Every structure is written in structure tokens, then in C-alpha cells.
Amino acid sequence: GPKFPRVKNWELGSITYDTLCAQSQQDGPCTPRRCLGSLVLPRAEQLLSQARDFINQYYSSIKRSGSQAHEERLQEVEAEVASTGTYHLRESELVFGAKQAWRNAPRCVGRIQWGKLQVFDARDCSSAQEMFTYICNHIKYATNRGNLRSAITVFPQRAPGRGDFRIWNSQLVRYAGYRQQDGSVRGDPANVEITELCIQHGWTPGNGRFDVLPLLLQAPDEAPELFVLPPELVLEVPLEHPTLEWFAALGLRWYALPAVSNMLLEIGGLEFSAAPFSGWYMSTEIGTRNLCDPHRYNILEDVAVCMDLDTRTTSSLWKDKAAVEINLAVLHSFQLAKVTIVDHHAATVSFMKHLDNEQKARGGCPADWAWIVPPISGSLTPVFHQEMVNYILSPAFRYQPDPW
Amino acid sequence: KFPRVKNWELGSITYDTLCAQSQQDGPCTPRRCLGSLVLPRKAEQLLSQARDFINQYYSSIKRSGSQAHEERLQEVEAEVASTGTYHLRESELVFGAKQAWRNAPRCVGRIQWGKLQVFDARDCSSAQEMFTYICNHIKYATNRGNLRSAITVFPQRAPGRGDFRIWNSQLVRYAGYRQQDGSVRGDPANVEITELCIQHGWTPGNGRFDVLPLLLQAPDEAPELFVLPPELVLEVPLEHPTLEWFAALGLRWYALPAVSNMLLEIGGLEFSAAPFSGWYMSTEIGTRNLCDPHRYNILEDVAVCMDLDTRTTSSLWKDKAAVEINLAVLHSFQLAKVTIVDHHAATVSFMKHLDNEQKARGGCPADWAWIVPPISGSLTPVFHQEMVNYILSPAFRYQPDPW
Ligand code: HEM
Ligand code: HEM
Ligand SMILES: Cc1cc(N)nc(C[C@H]2CNC[C@H]2NCCNCCc2cccc(F)c2)c1
Ligand SMILES: Cc1cc(N)nc(C[C@H]2CNC[C@H]2NCCNCCc2cccc(F)c2)c1
Ligand SMILES: C[C@H](O)[C@H](O)[C@H]1CNc2nc(N)[nH]c(=O)c2N1
Ligand SMILES: C[C@H](O)[C@H](O)[C@H]1CNc2nc(N)[nH]c(=O)c2N1
Ligand SMILES: [Zn+2]
């Protein structure tokens, strides 16, 4: 057959070949000898070639590949580098790049939305105060009283010998995690570090399971400054079950806006160290990972006890039954509160749609199976039965070392 | 050049060192992970594969670098130099087979690997004899409902001639009847093999739960049809702890998962018919065989029994019914006293298996996507454990359909 990965969906029996992977300029961590695909992280002319490829992508997307504008923009980019070491994106270039990084993201299952992203340019930003302002506008725009809109706020790009713009928080909205003297954690155990950093940098802390963290915002060559979100800005949903009436008495709650804030956006060799982006939740993020992970909120035993289940034996499927209801509770509460959310069935169906669109448009779609398939009910969703090719395309969102 | 491996639940790190002893590439390259594909795209050598396996075996029994070890290295050097192959001793076959399972990275049950009954069926010259061997293996492995892992190893591949082969994918599988209306009555994954059986003589039933015959092929001969005696194949009718109606459905499932189209490789020899069984992990029946949409696809039917709202994905009727079905599978096995392991218990012992291997070998190579169950993934400790995947020999491989 065709000298490209053959790709099969074992439910429908259909076949495709991924020709897009040929475009990858970056190596992942696998090799003929061993697959390392379940690892969460693995550890000048270089700028030009990256730059040039981005520009060629730009011009192709607007169907001007070959044109004088295209070659003149190339000429322009190299002259800028040859004289200053770096170069700068035109506005609509940044907009296309940022959308393209979302589109290229292999662990993201909501990419059917990729073309509909609001891009706030914040490349003029000059202070931690200003960063705060921009961040609050972002939150306001995106949250939109529960009718959620996709957005990304691009702060200034890394410069040579000039420290980065950095949000220290991992998300814009996150709950505190307080280390006790029992050794237990009150709140979100995920956040014990950032909580402790917030206090040492001067936050007066609370003592709840759901205290929203302040932002630690860092502007070039400064210590970070601390900022508290006004509570009218951070929309939250109290959780309740449509039938089990005792569920609301548990006092569980989650915030509406998932907003990753420590990821590095890379476009044509330029690195934007600060560029928080936000969409809406898939229900299993809250209901299965945040609420049921052993190493997070871990409410499974609680709920199962309330549910009168036999928690002394694995074969009662008591964990399974409680996760289903915690999940139905996440869905029902957001729906009631009229905040956007997507269940794992709908979400995955729509990534299938996204797969055969990308098949027609680019002949491939980088996808990480282990992340695409949901944490409950995996084989009940259609992505489980779809084979996937995972490779790195630029523009990309990368992970980056923590600032401290 | 050594992979760091982390558990995200507990924070612990390990380096895999086993994976250097890999001698056979998989499908990933640095440019792209293919980790999620089900199948691969498709003298002097055989000698050194044999050397290495014999080196393996004399360490297993702490006898490395000794007289019996050299005179076995010479026996092989001699046999290959003369005939271009060699043969294994029963005890070596036996260590080979257990290791084939030890090495199987899609396998969740490998805590058990040291405990395998091994039938040497290498003196087999006819399909007829295979039928008998296959039956003893069934009687043994089933043991009244007290399942015991077993393998039967038929005669190796030989340069001149046809393979000994079992046409079936499992020793026990239900059949697939295509209907006027393109609807497949009975079991969909086996529509083709049902048709092969008909093509070669079989009168068929028309139930959903009819047990297929066996098609056994001896070298260079057409396959012969053999019918499993109904008292041999142990079945479990499905019912539910609380839901009285669930029985009504005629739901049933057979006790013995026995693979039989895979090929066992050792010290470079190839065993084209080496069928093996253990026991089921409940989600193979409850989630996959019954809720796959391309399998019996019972979900809707059930969710309607349960009287859930099916107009909409966000009621999670899919999830709700999937759990009742898995719970019926477990109950009904436990009521009729047949080994069954749930997915929570199974993955817990896998974690324990990983720690054992880490102490013994420097690693366990495994395939995260197969090892994580098809419901409640992150509810199991395996969801949260990084894993490295690679090929070690001895091994079970896929091999082509004979027709
Ligand atoms: C519109 C609704 C959206 C949904 C439902 C969605 C869904 C998801 C989900 C479920 C994950 C995996 C989450 C995890 O378990 O850690 C994810 C990962 C990711 N999502 Fe999306 N997303 C949406 C919008 C966006 C937007 C606007 C972006 C960026 C512009 C985005 C970018 C990403 C990226 C970059 C990852 C990888 C995260 C990582 O590697 O840790 N999503 N998304
Ligand atoms: C003793 C109880 C055992 C249990 C509970 C068990 C469980 C499993 C499960 C759940 C899978 C994934 C199956 C699938 O989704 O297709 C699997 C795969 C596998 N098992 Fe085990 N197994 C057991 C014993 C054995 C034995 C005795 C052998 C051989 C002696 C074995 C060899 C394999 C192999 C080679 C695979 C991968 C084959 C493939 O690609 O389908 N297992 N097992
Ligand atoms: C933009 C957007 C939309 C959406 N629905 N969901 C998302 C992922 C967010 C929300 N809920 C989880 C978080 N995803 C980011 C978490 N990063 C995963 C990798 C990781 C994990 C832990 C430690 C690490 F070092 C690295 C983003
Ligand atoms: C020994 C043992 C015990 C156990 N519990 N489970 C097993 C796997 C068997 C049983 N339950 C599923 C089946 N798995 C073997 C076949 N592989 C499944 C998918 C596949 C793979 C390759 C080609 C295909 F066309 C399809 C073995
Ligand atoms: C070890 C394993 O890779 C890790 O638990 C991954 C698996 N898949 C995931 N998938 C998603 N969407 N999010 C995750 O955090 C993880 N965790
Ligand atoms: C396409 C995907 O790799 C395929 O559906 C795999 C995923 N994981 C699996 N895991 C197990 N145990 N069994 C399977 O058949 C599969 N199928
Ligand atoms: Zn890989």
C-alpha cells in the first residue's frame, strides 16, 4: 500500500492513511525499540527555518503561496532576524498561529471548535498590574455569564537576555490545598505547592475545601506580584443530583472556566511564555478526575457510603456506580445553572467528526489515544475503537519548567 | 538511554533497564507514535536466538556456565549445522511458554505467570489427534469451574511444509448468522468463521448462543470439522442481583477464554498451533462482548429495561446500563462457581506484578491502552502508572489467517 501510517477504526472497519505526519519537524520520545507514549512528560538558522515554515503555512492558509506578498514577508522576516536576532508577528499571523496551535494539540478532544477562538493581543503589556487587567478581561469575556467562549490572551514574547512574562498559577482559577498537621490535605491536593508559594509571597489564606487562589503574575526581571480575583468574576456551580437529594448537602462545587495558564505557545520559533487559554469543561474532567482521583478530592468512598453501597469488596462495582452519579451530578448542575458543559459521549462523537474533516483538509490528525479516550466508559465512546497517530506539529502548545 | 517511569498517584519513579534486552523493533519511530495500532503493518540468526534462549534457560535454573549448559549449547550448534533447525526438550519448552506469557505486554493477568500447566502435544500427526488433545485441554482447564491456566503445544513449523493450525480464534466462540435483512443474528465478530464452518460441512443453529465447531488443519491438508461435546463446554447463564427481568434476556457466556490462532515463538522456533487459556476478567464479557456496538450491542435494550431516558447522552444511560451488565457478569459467575476476576481486583494485582518484575528484571514491558480497562479507567491504579512497551522473546505473536 501507501508508504504512510495506515489507520483503522475497528468499529466501522474503515481505513485511512495519515500523510500529515510527514510535516513534523520535532521528534517525540518513541523509537523502533520501545514505545514511550504513555509518558505524561518526557525530557539563528534554527530560528530562520522555523520562521520560514510558519510564514509558508500562513500564506497557504490564505491561498497566496508563491505570491510577492509571501516572498516579501519572507524577505522581511529574515532581514529582521539578521539585524536583531529576533522578529515579530503581524497581527493576523498571531491569530492564525494561535488557532493552529490548538488545532495541532494531540491531547485535546474539543478541537472541532478550533476555528472559533477569540484572540486577544496583549503584546503591548508592560506590567504585572496590566497583566492582571488583561487577565480579568479574558475571564469576563470567556465566562460571558455562563455562555462560555474560547479565548487566549497573548502576552509579550521571550526576548534574549530579558526575563520572561510568566503566570505562576497552572490555571487562572484553582482551589487552594492546605497541608495539615495530620498530614492530610484540606482542599485540592494538586495545589499544595502553589498555595504555599502564595502564602510566602503574602496571601492571607482561608480554610475551606474550595478557596479560590490569588494569581502570582511575573513581569520581566521582577519578583512576581500577587492579585486576588474579584469574586463576582469567578463563576461557580454548586453541585446537586437530579434524584439523590442528599448529594447537595455534601457542599461540593466547581468553577466554570477551565483556563490553562502555564503553557508555552510557540509560533514560527517565537516563544510566548505567557498566553492563558480557556474553553469549556468536559464533564469527566470534574466528575471523574478532580472529584474521584485518589490523589485529589477522592470523594468516591463518601458518596458510595451515602449511596448505601458495599464498600468492602471490589466486585460490588461500588466505585463504578458512585463515579457514574458524581458524573451525572456534574452534568445536571451545570445544565441547571445554565453554564456550558459537554458530556464525554457528545464530546467524543464530535472529535470523530473532527477526524474526518481533518482527513479531508490535511490528511491526518495528531492524536494521543490515552488522553483522547475518557477516564470513565472508554469503550462506550467511539474514539476507543479509532487508531491514532501521535506526532508533534508546530505551532504548538508546549509544557515549560515552573518559574521558581 | 534508560526510560524514567512515574506513577502519578503516589509520586514514585523507576528506571526500566529490561528494555535493552529487546531484539525486535515495534511500530513507533521518533517522528511518530503508533503505539495504538492493534496489529503490525505486515542458520546464523536462528542459531543465536537459540543460543540466547538456552542462555535464558540455564540462568532460570541457576545452572548458567556449567557442564549441562555447554553440552546443550553444543547439541544445538550441531543440530542446526546439520538440519538447519533443532528441537526443544520438554523442560525447556516449559520454561519458554511461561516466559512467553511473562513477556506479553497486553496481558493484565501476569501475576499468574509462574503457574501454567503445559501439555506437550508435539507427537501429533493428524487433525483427529489435535481434537483429542484440544478436548483434554478443555476438561483440564475448566476443572468443574475451578479454572486453571493451560497451554497445549502442537508441532513446530518446518521449512518443507504446511503448518499445524487452528482455524478458530478461540477454542470456544459463538456463531454469526447473516440474515436476509443484513442484520447479523448471533455473534458479529465471527460471521466469517461461521461461514467457513458451513462451507466445510456444518449444519448450523439459529440461536444467538450456538457454539461453533472446530476446524483443525494438519500440514498441507484441508481442515477437518470437529464438534465439541456439549457437556465439555461449560456455560454461565447471566442474571442480576436485584433486577429480576435481566434473566429473561437469554443472556449467557461460556466459561473458558482460550486463544488459538496465535503463534508461540521460542529460541527461534515457531509454534503455529499453541492454544492457551486462563480465566475471564469480567469486563471482557460485560463491556466488550456485550456492549461493543459491533458485537451483541445490548446496551440500548437494557437501558430500556432499566427505563432510563435514551433520547440524550447526558443522562448517561450508556454508563448506567454498562455497570448493571458488568455486575450481572460477576454475580452470575460467582453464583455458578466459576473463576472470574473483576477489573479492580485484576489491575491491583497487576500493580503488584509490576513491583515484582521491577525487583526481578528491571522492568516489565506493558501496553497501557490494553491494560487499562474499558470502563472506569482512572478508577483503577493502572490508569495512573506510566508504562514502557517493547518486545521480548519468548513471545506470542499474531500470524495470518490460514485461508
Ligand atoms: C471548547 C471546549 C473545549 C474542550 C471541551 C476541551 C477539552 C479538552 C480536554 C478534555 C483535554 C484533556 C484534559 C486533561 O485531562 O488534562 C484538553 C486538553 C488540551 N486542550 Fe482542549 N478543550 C476545549 C477548548 C480548548 C481551547 C481553546 C484550547 C486552547 C486554545 C484547548 C487546548 C487544549 C490543550 C493545549 C490540551 C493539552 C493539555 C495538556 O497537554 O495537558 N482546548 N482539552
Ligand atoms: C489467568 C488469568 C488471565 C487473565 C484474567 C487474563 C486477562 C487478559 C486480558 C483482559 C487481556 C486483554 C484481552 C483483550 O482485551 O483482548 C489479556 C491478553 C493476553 N493474555 Fe492474558 N489473561 C490470563 C491468563 C493468560 C494466560 C494463561 C496466557 C498465556 C498462557 C495469557 C496470555 C495473553 C496474551 C498473549 C494476551 C494478548 C493477546 C492479544 O493481543 O489479544 N493470559 N489477558
Ligand atoms: C483549555 C482547556 C479546556 C478544557 N476543557 N480542559 C483543559 C485542561 C485543563 C482543565 N482540567 C485539567 C487541565 N489540563 C491541564 C493539566 N495538564 C495535564 C498534564 C499534567 C497534569 C499534572 C501535572 C503535570 F505536570 C502535567 C483545557
Ligand atoms: C488467556 C486469556 C485470558 C483472558 N482473560 N483473555 C484473553 C484474551 C481473549 C479473551 N477476550 C478477548 C480475546 N483477545 C484475543 C484477540 N484480540 C482481541 C482483538 C483483536 C486482536 C487482533 C486481531 C483482531 F482482529 C482482533 C486471553
Ligand atoms: C500514566 C498516564 O499516561 C496518565 O495517567 C494519563 C493517562 N491519560 C490521561 N488523559 C487525560 N485526558 N488526562 C490525563 O491526565 C491523563 N493521564
Ligand atoms: C483502537 C484501539 O487500540 C483498540 O480499540 C484497543 C484499545 N485497547 C484495548 N484493550 C484491550 N484489553 N482489548 C482491546 O481489544 C483493546 N482495543
Ligand atoms: Zn509510541
Describe this structure in words.
- Two copies of one chain form a homodimer.
- The first copy, chain A, has 404 residues and is of the alpha+beta class.
- Chain A folds into three domains: 18-123 and 150-160 and 264-278 and 348-372, Alpha-Beta Complex (Nitric Oxide Synthase, Chain A, domain 1), CATH 3.90.340; 124-149 and 164-235 and 399-403, Alpha-Beta Complex (Nitric Oxide Synthase,Heme Domain, Chain A, domain 2); 236-258 and 281-346, Alpha-Beta Complex (Bovine Endothelial Nitric Oxide Synthase Heme Domain, Chain: A,domain 3).
- Chain A contains ten helices and 16 strands.
- Chain A has helices at residues 45-61, 68-84, 91-104, 128-143, 192-200, 283-292, 300-306, 318-336, 344-362, 369-372; strands spanning 6-8, 15-17, 118-121, 151-154, 166-167, 177-179, 185-187, 215-218, 225-227, 236-238, 253-255, 259-260, 264-267, 270-272, 277-278, 396-398.
- A four-stranded mixed β-sheet of chain A has the order 3-4-15-12, sandwiched between helices. A three-stranded antiparallel β-sheet of chain A has the order 5-8-9, with helices on one face.
- In chain A, a hairpin with a 2-residue loop joins β13 and β14.
- In chain A, α1 packs antiparallel against α2 and α6 (283-292) packs across α8 (318-336).
- The longest helix of chain A is centred in the C-terminal third of the chain and has 19 residues, at 318-336.
- The radius of gyration of chain A is 23 Å and the shape is globular.
- Chains A and B meet through β1, α6, α8 and α9 of A and α6, α8 and α9 of B.
- Chain B: Keywords: Blood coagulation, Calcium, Calmodulin-binding, Cell membrane, Cytoplasm, Cytoskeleton, FAD, Flavoprotein, FMN, Golgi apparatus, Heme, Hemostasis, Iron, Lipoprotein, Membrane, Metal-binding, Myristate, NADP, Oxidoreductase, Palmitate, Phosphoprotein, Zinc.
- Chain B: It is found in: Cell membrane; Membrane, Caveola; Cytoplasm, Cytoskeleton; Golgi apparatus.
